[PDB]
C-alpha cells in the first residue's frame, strides 16, 4: 500500500514464529522498542497489528517514535510510548518500473500533524492561502498527494523499500497470538513455575471460587502481582498462592 493509505492487518487467534522472521536475512532494518526480538518468540499477545507501506531509503529512519519529516508528520505517525518492531527491506526489484512506478504516493501537504496510528486518505484540495479552494486545484490550492519516481537506476536513497511495522498491545485479555512450544498438563496444589499466556511466576495453583467475568483474563493484588489466572484451555479460575516460605 501507499504510505498515506498504509494498510493495517489485525493478527489474532493463531500461532506465529518470530524467530524465523528474525533469522531471515532479507531485512535491512530490524529495530525493536520496548521488547527485544530474541525475547519475542516466548511472549504471548492479545492482538498483533501489521502495518505495511512503501517508502524510499532515506525516509526509513522516519518510521520511529519521535521523528520528524513528511512521512512521520503527514502520512504515518508512531506514538512516543510505542512498543513493537519496525522492519524494512529494499524492494527495488519489485516496486520499480523502467519508466517509473507512480502507484506509490505520499501526503505532501497537510494542515497539521497526524495523531499516532492515524490514517488520512482524504483527497481534498489543500487550502494553502486565505482564499477557499472549493475543491478547485490551482493557485494556493495544491493536490495533497505526490508520487515517488521509483526507477531501477535510482540511488539507494530513492529506491523503494517495503516496511512492515509490528505493534504489540498487552490488553488485559486472553493472549491468543503466541510464539511456539507445546502446552503441558497442569498440576494443582504444588509449587510450580507457571506460564499462562506469557505471564510467568512461581506459586501454588489451586481451585478458586472467584467468578471472573467473561472478558476478564487476569487478576491482580495490591502489589500489582498476579492474584489469579483463567486457564487458557479450560475456562476455570485458579488462585496463585506464593510457595510456602518463612524465616529460619
Amino acid at each position, epitope marked *: 500500500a501507499s504510505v498515506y493509505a498504509w494498510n493495517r492487518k489485525r493478527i489474532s487467534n493463531c500461532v506465529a514464529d518470530y524467530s524465523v522472521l528474525y533469522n531471515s536475512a532479507s531485512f535491512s532494518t530490524f529495530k525493536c522498542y520496548g521488547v527485544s526480538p530474541t525475547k519475542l518468540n516466548d511472549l504471548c499477545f492479545t492482538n498483533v497489528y501489521a502495518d505495511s507501506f512503501v517508502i524510499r531509503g532515506d525516509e526509513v529512519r522516519q518510521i520511529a517514535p519521535g521523528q520528524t519529516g513528511k512521512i512521520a508528520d503527514y502520512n504515518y505517525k508512531l506514538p512516543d510510548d510505542f512498543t513493537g518492531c519496525v522492519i524494512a527491506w529494499n524492494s527495488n526489484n519489485l516496486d520499480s*518500473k523502467v519508466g*517509473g512506478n507512480y502507484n506509490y504516493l505520499y501526503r505532501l501537504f497537510r494542515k497539521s500533524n497526524l495523531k499516532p496510528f492515524e490514517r488520512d486518505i482524504s483527497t481534498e484540495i489543500y487550502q494553502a492561502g486565505s482564499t477557499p479552494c472549493n475543491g478547485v486545484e*490551482g493557485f494556493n490550492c*495544491y*493536490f495533497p498527494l505526490q*508520487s515517488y519516481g521509483f526507477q531501477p537506476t535510482n540511488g539507494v536513497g530513492y529506491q523503494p523499500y517495503r516496511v512492515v511495522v509490528l505493534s504489540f498491545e498487552l490488553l488485559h485479555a486472553p493472549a491468543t497470538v503466541c510464539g511456539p512450544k507445546k502446552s503441558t498438563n497442569l498440576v494443582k496444589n504444588k509449587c510450580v513455575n507457571f506460564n499462562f499466556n506469557g505471564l510467568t511466576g512461581t506459586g501454588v495453583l489451586t481451585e478458586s471460587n472467584k467468578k471472573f467475568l467473561p472478558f476478564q483474563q487476569f487478576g491482580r493484588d495490591i502489589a500489582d502481582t498476579t492474584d489469579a489466572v483463567r486457564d487458557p484451555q479450560t475456562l476455570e479460575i485458579l488462585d496463585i498462592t506464593p510457595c510456602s516460605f518463612g524465616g529460619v
Partner: antibody, heavy 122, light 109 residues
Framework: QVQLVQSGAEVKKPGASVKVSCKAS????????MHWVRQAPGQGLEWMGW????????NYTQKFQGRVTMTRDTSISTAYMELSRLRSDDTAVYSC???????????????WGQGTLVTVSS | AVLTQPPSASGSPGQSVTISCTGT?????????VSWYQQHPGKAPKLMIY???KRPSGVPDRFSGSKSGNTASLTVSGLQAEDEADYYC??????????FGGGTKLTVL
C-alpha cells in the same frame, strides 16, 4: 538535468486540429506543474494554461477554453496539448514550460521546451 | 487582461534602465507573484525575476525587480551589450490564470 523535448513542426489548415507532445526527462515528471505558452512570430508571449502531471487537473485561460485540451501520460513522462478549430492567427511556436515550484503552480518557469511551430496557412 | 508594457526601453552602456509593467488591481496589485522573462531572438525565454523582487540563481544582480501599486518595474543597472534582448513580465491574474506583458525591447544605444 531537465530536458523538455517537443514534437516537430506541424502545418495545418483552418478547421483542423493539432496535437503537440512534450516529453520530460531528468526529474520526477509528476513533481512539477507543466505550463503551455505560445509565441507568434515577432509578437509576444501568451499564456495558455497549466496541467498538473501528478493529479491530472488542468486550467485554461478564457480565450482558449473550448478549443484547447491538455493531457499527460505519466508512464512516458510526456505532456500533450491539443488545439482544435484552428484559425490563421493561431500560427505560433507552442512551448511547454515547467513550473519551478515543487508540486505547486506559481507561474514561474525555469525550464522550457525547444518549441513546436504550428502553421495554420490559408 | 494584458499587462501594459512599454514598447521600447533603451540606454547607453553602463547606464541604468527601468522597464515598467502596468496591470490592474486583480493581478499586479492583487498578488506578489509578478515575474520577468528575458528572450533573446530565436531562443527560449529565460526567467530573470519571480515574486516581484526575488532573483533566481545565476541571474546578475544588475537585474532587479520592484512593484508599486498596479505597476511593476524591472530595473537593469550597468547596461551591457549582452543585455540587448526582449523582456516580458508575467503575473497571476486570479481564477488559476497567469498573464504576460506585451513585451519590451531593450536596446543598448
Amino acid at each position: 538535468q531537465v530536458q523538455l523535448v517537443q514534437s516537430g513542426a506541424e502545418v495545418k489548415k483552418p478547421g483542423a486540429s493539432v496535437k503537440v507532445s512534450c516529453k520530460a526527462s531528468g526529474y520526477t515528471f509528476t513533481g512539477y506543474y507543466m505550463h503551455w505558452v505560445r509565441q507568434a512570430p515577432g509578437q509576444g508571449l501568451e499564456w495558455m494554461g497549466w496541467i498538473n502531471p501528478n493529479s491530472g487537473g488542468t486550467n485554461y485561460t478564457q480565450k482558449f477554453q473550448g478549443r484547447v485540451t491538455m493531457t499527460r501520460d505519466t508512464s512516458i513522462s510526456t505532456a500533450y496539448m491539443e488545439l482544435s478549430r484552428l484559425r490563421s492567427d493561431d500560427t505560433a511556436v507552442y512551448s511547454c514550460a515547467r513550473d519551478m515550484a515543487f508540486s505547486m503552480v506559481r507561474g514561474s518557469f525555469d525550464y522550457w521546451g525547444q518549441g513546436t511551430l504550428v502553421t495554420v496557412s490559408s | 487582461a494584458v499587462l501594459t508594457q512599454p514598447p521600447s526601453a533603451s540606454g547607453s552602456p553602463g547606464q541604468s534602465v527601468t522597464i515598467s509593467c502596468t496591470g490592474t488591481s486583480s493581478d499586479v496589485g492583487g498578488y506578489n507573484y509578478v515575474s520577468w522573462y528575458q528572450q533573446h531572438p530565436g531562443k527560449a525565454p529565460k526567467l530573470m525575476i519571480y515574486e516581484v523582487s526575488k532573483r533566481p540563481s545565476g541571474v546578475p544582480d544588475r537585474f532587479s525587480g520592484s512593484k508599486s501599486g498596479n505597476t511593476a518595474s524591472l530595473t537593469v543597472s550597468g547596461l551591457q551589450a549582452e543585455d540587448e534582448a526582449d523582456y516580458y513580465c508575467s503575473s497571476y491574474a486570479g481564477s488559476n490564470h497567469w498573464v504576460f506583458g506585451g513585451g519590451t525591447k531593450l536596446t543598448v544605444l
